[PDB]
Coordinates of C-alpha atoms and ligand atoms in Angstrom, one line a residue:
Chain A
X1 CA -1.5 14.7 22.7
X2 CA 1.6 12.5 22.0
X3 CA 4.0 12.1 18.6
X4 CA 2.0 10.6 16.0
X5 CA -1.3 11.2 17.5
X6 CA -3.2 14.5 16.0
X7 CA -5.6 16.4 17.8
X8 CA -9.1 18.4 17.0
X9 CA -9.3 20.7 19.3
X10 CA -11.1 18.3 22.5
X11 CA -10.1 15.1 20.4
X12 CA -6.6 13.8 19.8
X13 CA -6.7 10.7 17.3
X14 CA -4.6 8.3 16.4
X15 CA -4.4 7.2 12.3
X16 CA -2.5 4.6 12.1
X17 CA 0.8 4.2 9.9
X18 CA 0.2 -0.3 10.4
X19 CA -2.2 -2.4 9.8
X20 CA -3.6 -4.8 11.9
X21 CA -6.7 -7.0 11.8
X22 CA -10.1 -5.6 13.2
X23 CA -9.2 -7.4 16.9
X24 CA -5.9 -6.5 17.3
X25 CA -7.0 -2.8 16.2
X26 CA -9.7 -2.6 18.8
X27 CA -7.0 -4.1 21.5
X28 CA -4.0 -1.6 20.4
X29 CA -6.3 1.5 20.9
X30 CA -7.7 0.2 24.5
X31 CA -3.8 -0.4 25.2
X32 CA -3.5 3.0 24.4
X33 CA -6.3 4.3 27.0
X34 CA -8.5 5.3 24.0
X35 CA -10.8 3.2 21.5
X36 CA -11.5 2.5 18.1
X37 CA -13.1 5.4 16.7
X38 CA -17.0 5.6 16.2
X39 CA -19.8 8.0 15.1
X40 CA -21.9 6.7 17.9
X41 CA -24.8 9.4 16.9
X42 CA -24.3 8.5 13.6
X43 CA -23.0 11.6 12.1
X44 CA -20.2 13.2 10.6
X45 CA -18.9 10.4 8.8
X46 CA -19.1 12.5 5.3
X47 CA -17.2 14.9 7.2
X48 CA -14.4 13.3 9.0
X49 CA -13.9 11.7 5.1
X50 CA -11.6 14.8 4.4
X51 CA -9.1 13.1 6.9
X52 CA -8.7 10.0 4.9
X53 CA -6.6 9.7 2.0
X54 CA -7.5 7.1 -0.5
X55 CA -7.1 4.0 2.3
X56 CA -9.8 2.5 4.5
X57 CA -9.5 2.6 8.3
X58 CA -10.9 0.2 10.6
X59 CA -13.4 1.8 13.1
X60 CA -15.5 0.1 16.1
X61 CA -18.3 -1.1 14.2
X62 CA -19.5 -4.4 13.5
X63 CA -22.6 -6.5 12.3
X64 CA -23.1 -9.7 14.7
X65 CA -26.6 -9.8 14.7
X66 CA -26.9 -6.7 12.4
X67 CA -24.2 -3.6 12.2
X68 CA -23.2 -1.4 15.9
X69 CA -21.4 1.3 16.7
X70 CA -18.5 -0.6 19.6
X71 CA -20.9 0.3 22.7
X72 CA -23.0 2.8 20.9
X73 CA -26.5 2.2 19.3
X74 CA -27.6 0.3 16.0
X75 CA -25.9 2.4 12.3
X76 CA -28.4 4.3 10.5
X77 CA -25.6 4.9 7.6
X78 CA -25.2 3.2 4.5
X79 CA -22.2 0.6 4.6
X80 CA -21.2 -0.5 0.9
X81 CA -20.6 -4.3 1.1
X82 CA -19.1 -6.4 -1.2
X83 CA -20.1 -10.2 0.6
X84 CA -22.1 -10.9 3.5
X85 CA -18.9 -13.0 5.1
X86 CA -17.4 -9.1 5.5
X87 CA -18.7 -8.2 9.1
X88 CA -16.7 -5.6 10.5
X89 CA -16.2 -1.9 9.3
X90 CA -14.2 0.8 7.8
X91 CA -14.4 4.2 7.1
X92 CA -12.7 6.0 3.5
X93 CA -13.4 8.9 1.7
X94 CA -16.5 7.8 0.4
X95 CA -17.9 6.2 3.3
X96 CA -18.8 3.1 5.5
X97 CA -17.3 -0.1 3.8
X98 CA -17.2 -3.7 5.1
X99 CA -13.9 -6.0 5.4
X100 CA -13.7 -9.4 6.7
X101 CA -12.4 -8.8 10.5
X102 CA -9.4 -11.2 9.5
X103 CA -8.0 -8.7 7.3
X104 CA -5.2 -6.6 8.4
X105 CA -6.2 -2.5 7.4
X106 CA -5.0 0.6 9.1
X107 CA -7.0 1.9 12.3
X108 CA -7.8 5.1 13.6
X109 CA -8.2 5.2 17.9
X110 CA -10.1 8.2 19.3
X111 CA -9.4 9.6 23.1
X112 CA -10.6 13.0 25.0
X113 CA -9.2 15.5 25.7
Chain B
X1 CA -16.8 -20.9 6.3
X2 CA -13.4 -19.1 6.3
X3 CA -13.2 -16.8 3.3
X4 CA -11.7 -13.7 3.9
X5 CA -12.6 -10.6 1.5
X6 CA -10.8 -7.2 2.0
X7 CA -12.8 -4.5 1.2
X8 CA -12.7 -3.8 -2.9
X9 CA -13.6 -0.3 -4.0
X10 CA -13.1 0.8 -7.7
X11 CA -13.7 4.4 -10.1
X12 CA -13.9 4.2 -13.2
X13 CA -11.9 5.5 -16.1
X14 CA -8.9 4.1 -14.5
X15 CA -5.6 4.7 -16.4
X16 CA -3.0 1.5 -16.9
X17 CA -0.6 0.0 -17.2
X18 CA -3.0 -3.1 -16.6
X19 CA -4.0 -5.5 -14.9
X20 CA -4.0 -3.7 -12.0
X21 CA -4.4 -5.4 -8.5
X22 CA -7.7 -4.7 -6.6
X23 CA -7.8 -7.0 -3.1
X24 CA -6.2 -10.1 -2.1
X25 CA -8.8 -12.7 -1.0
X26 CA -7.9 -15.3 0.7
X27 CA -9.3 -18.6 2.4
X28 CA -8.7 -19.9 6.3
X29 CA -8.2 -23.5 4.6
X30 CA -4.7 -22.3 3.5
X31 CA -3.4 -22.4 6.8
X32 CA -4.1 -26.5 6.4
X33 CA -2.1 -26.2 2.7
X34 CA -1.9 -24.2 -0.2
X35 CA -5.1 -23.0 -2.1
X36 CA -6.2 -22.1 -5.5
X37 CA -8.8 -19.8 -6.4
X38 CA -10.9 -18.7 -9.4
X39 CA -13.4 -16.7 -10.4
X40 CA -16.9 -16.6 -12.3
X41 CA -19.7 -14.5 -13.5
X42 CA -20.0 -11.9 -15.7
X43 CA -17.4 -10.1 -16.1
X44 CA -15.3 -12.9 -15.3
X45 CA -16.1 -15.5 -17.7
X46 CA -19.0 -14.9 -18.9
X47 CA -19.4 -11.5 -21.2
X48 CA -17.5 -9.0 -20.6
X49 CA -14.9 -11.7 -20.6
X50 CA -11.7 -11.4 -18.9
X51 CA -12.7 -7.3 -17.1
X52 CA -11.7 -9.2 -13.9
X53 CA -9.1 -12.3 -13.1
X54 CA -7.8 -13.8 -10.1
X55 CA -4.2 -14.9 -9.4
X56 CA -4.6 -18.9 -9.3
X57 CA -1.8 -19.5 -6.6
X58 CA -2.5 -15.9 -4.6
X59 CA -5.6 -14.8 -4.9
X60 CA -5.3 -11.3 -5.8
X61 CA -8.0 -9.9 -8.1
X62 CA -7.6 -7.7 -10.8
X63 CA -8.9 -5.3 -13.4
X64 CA -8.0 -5.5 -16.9
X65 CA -9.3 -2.5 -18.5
X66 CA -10.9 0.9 -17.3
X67 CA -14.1 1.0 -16.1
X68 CA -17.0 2.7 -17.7
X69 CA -19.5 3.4 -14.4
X70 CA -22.3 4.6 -16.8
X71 CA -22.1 1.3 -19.1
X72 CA -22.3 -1.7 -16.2
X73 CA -22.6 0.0 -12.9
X74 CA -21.7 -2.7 -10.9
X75 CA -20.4 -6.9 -11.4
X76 CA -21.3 -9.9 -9.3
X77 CA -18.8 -12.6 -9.3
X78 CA -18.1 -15.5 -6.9
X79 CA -15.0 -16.5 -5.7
X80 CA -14.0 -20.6 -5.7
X81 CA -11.2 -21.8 -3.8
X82 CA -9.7 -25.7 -4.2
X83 CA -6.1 -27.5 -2.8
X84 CA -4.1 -29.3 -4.4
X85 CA -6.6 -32.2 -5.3
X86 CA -8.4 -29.5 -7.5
X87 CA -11.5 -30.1 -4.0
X88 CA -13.5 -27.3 -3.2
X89 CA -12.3 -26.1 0.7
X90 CA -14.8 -23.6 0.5
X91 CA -18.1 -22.7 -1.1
X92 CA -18.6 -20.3 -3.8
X93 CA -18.7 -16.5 -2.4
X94 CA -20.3 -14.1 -4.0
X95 CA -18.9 -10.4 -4.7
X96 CA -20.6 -7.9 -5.7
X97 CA -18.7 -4.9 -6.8
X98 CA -19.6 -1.3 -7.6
X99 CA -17.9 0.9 -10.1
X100 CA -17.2 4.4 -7.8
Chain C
X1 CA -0.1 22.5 14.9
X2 CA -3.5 21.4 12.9
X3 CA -5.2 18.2 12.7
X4 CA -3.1 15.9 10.4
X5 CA 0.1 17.2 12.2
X6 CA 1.4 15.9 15.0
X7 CA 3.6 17.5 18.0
X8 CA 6.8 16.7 19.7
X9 CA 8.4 19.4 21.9
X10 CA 8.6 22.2 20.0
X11 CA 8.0 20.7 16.9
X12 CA 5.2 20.1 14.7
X13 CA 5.1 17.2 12.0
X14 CA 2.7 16.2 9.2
X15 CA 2.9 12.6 8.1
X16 CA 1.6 12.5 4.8
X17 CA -1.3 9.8 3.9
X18 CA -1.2 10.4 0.2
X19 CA 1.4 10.1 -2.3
X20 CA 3.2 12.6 -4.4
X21 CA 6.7 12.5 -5.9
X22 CA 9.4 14.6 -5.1
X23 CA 9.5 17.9 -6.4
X24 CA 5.6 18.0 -5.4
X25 CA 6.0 16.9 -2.0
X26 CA 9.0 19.7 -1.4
X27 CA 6.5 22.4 -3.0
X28 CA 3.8 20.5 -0.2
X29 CA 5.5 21.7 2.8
X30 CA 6.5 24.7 1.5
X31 CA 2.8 26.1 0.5
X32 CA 2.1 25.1 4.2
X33 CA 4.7 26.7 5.5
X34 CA 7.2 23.8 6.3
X35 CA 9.6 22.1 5.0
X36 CA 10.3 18.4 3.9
X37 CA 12.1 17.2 6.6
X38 CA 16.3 16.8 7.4
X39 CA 18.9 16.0 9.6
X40 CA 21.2 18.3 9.0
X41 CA 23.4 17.1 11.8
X42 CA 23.5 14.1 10.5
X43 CA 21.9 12.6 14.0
X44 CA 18.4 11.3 14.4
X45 CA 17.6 8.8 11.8
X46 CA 17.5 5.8 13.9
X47 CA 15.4 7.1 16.6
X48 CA 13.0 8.6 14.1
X49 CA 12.9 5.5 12.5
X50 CA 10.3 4.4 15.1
X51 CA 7.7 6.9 14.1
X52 CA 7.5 4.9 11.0
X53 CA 5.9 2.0 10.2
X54 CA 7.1 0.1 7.1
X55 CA 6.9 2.7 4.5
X56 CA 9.1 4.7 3.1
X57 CA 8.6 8.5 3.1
X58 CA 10.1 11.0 0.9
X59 CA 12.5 13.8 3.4
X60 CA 14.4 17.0 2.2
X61 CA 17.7 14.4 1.1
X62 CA 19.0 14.7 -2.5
X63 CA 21.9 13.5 -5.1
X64 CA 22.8 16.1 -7.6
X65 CA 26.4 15.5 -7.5
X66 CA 26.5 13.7 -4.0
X67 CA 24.0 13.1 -1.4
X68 CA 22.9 16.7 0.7
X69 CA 20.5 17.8 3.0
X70 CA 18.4 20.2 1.8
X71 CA 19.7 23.8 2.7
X72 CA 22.1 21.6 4.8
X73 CA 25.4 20.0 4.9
X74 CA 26.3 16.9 2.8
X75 CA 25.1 13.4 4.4
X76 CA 27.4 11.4 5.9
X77 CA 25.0 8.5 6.9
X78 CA 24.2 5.6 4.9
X79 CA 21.6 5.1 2.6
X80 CA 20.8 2.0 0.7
X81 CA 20.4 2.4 -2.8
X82 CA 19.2 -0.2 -5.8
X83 CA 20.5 2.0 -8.9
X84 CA 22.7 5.2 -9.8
X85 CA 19.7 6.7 -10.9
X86 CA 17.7 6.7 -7.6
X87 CA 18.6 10.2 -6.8
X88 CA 15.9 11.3 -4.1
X89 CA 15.9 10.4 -0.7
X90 CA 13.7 8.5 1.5
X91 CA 13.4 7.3 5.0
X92 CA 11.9 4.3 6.8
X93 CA 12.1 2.0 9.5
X94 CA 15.6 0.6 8.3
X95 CA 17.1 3.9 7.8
X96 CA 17.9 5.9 4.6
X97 CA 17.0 4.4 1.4
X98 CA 17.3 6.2 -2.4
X99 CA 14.7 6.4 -4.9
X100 CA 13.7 7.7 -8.1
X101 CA 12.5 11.3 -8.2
X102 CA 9.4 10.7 -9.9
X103 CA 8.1 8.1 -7.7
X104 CA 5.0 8.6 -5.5
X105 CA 5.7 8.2 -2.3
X106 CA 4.4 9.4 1.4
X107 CA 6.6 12.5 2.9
X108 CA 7.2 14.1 6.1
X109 CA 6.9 18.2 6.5
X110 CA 8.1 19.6 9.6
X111 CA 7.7 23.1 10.9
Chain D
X1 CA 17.7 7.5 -19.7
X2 CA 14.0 7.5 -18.4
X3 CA 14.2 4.7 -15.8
X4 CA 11.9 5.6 -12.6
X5 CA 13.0 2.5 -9.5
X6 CA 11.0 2.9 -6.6
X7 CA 13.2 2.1 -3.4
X8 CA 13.2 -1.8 -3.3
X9 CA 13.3 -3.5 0.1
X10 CA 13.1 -7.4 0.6
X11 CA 13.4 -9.2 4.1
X12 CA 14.4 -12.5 4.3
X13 CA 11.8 -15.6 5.2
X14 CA 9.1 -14.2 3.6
X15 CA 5.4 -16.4 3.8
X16 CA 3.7 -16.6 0.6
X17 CA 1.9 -17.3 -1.3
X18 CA 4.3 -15.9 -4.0
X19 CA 5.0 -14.6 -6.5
X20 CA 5.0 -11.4 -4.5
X21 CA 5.3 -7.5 -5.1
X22 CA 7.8 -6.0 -4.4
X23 CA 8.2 -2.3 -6.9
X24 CA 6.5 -1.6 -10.1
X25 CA 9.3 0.1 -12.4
X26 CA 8.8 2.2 -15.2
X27 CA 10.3 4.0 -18.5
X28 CA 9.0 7.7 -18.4
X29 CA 9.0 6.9 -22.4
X30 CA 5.6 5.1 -21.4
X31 CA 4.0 8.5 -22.0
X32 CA 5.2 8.1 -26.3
X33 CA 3.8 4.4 -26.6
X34 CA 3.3 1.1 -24.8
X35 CA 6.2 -0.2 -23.0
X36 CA 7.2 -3.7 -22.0
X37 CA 9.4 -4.4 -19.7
X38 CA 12.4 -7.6 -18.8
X39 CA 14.9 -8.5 -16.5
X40 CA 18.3 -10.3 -16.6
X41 CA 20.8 -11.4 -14.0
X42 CA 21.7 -14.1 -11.7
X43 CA 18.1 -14.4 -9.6
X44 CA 16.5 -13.7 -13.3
X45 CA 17.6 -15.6 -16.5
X46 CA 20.9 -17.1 -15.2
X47 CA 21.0 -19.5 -11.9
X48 CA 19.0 -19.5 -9.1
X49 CA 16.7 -18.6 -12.0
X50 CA 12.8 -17.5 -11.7
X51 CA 13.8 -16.1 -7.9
X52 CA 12.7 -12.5 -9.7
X53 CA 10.4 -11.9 -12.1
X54 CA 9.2 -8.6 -14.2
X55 CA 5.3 -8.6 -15.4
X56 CA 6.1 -7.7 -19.0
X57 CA 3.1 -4.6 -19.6
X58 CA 3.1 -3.7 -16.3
X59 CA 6.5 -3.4 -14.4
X60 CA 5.5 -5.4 -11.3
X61 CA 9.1 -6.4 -10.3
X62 CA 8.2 -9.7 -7.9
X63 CA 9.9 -12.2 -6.1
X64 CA 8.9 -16.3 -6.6
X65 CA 9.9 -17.8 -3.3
X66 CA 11.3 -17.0 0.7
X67 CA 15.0 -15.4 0.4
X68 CA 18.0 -16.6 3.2
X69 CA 20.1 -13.8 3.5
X70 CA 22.5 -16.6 4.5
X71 CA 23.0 -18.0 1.7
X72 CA 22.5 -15.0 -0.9
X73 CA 22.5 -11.6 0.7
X74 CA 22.3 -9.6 -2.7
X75 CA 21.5 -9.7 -6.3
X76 CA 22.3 -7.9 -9.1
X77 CA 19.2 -7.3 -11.7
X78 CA 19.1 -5.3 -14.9
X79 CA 16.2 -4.3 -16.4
X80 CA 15.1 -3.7 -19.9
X81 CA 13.0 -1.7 -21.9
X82 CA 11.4 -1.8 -25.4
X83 CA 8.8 -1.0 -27.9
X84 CA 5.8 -3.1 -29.7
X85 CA 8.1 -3.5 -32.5
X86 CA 11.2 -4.7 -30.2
X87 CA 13.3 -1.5 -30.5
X88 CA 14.6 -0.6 -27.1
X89 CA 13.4 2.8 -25.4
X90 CA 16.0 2.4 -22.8
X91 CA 19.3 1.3 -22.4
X92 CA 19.3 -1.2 -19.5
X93 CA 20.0 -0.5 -15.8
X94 CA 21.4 -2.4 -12.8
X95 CA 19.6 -3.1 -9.9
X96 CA 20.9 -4.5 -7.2
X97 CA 18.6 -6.0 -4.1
X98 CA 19.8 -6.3 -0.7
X99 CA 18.5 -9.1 1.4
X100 CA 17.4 -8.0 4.8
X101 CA 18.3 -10.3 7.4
Ligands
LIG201 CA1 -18.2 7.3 -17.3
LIG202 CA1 18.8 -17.0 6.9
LIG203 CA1 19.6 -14.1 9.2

């Protein structure tokens, strides 16, 4: 995959050196032929929280009418909240976090292959 | 409706110099004019006093002093925002945050 | 060229997402068998500048007795600097910019 | 001479609100006892004053209001150290702040 993205063997991601707000995220990485990364089965979050320093990330998943993965199913994770006005989501070391969807955070895009 | 709260994680034991900025919240309304914000609630103004403060005129919270996670696990405060009439623009938010 | 690096031709470049200051990250790159990154030639700062966002990341540039590239020649670019005591180098968007040594800052390994 | 200056950029037209980061500086003699920090300069304590300020216990180095390049493309700073009881720790040191246009 291309300068600046890394890959994982079948996955090449994209963690972002920016930060943009949760829309303009989601719109850069379709831009880019790939989307805003999820854990769609909801699993290896813990895991992929050795790739992230001490920032959080934005990711595709949001609470409308309750949290979802960006086209994937309902979460079954915890996500640590601090106000119920903070609906979309972000991954860091320790895990799922909310963030109001105005505010601008890094993002990491997912593609394969 | 237009608070906007970044997402505020925090360990404890947390070495100085202090205060030391955690998230800058903000409010929609200031795109109409400037706001001012405050804070309440314990740890805010009510005991422990003072462990958290906002910046009136930007809105960045803060910590004043390193956290202890096994004395107060976690602090609920609520965020007030006003222009320059001293009105409210928003209602009070609360925030709850939990010592890592 | 693991994940956390990044490829270009024959190159392979790790980005750092923490902080460390400069001593630490030159000892970084060099336990991964790297090292913290230089243009020796003098040539490549501009371009490179677009891999980088808007922060500055520590390279292989430092001023002992004048500014040198690490196991290279002496720099002959500028680099903006606040004091005379900023004597590690840094690169960002803008170009070259000095800093203290004992600063935390991102840095860039290349292998 | 302890001084540790992170690399200080500032573009011009910046949108508040301010006061706004821009480094936090520091005296490695920090690690003996408490330090508290000042600046002087035109920009600081001598006209346009207030455009920079230094948080005293903590180093923030911040700037009150938008910059025009046009009109002031650099400033020269010098910052100060000392102890609770006033003695200096540090001797100062200029900083000097380019304006990005
Ligand atoms: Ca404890
Ligand atoms: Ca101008
Ligand atoms: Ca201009």
């Amino acid at each position: 995959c291309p300068i600046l993205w890394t890959r994982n063997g079948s996955h090449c991601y994209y963690f972002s050196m920016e930060k943009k707000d949760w829309n303009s995220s989601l719109k850069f990485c379709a831009d880019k032929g790939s989307h805003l990364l999820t854990f769609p089965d909801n699993q290896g979050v813990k895991l992929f929280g050795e790739y992230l320093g001490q920032d959080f990330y934005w990711i595709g998943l949001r609470n409308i009418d309750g949290w979802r993965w960006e086209g994937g199913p309902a979460l079954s994770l915890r996500i640590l909240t601090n106000s119920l006005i903070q609906r979309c989501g972000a991954i860091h070391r320790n895990g799922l976090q909310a963030s109001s969807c105005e505010v601008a955070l890094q993002w990491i895009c997912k593609k394969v292959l | 409706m237009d608070w906007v709260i970044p997402p505020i994680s925090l360990p404890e034991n947390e070495k100085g110099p202090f205060p030391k900025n955690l998230v800058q919240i903000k409010s929609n309304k200031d795109k109409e004019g400037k706001v001012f914000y405050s804070i309440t609630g314990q740890g805010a103004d009510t005991p422990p006093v003072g462990v958290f403060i906002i910046e009136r005129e930007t809105g960045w919270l803060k910590v004043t002093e390193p956290l202890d996670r096994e004395r107060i696990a976690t602090y609920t405060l609520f965020s007030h925002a006003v222009s320059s009439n001293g009105n409210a623009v928003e209602d009070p938010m609360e925030i709850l945050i939990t010592v890592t």
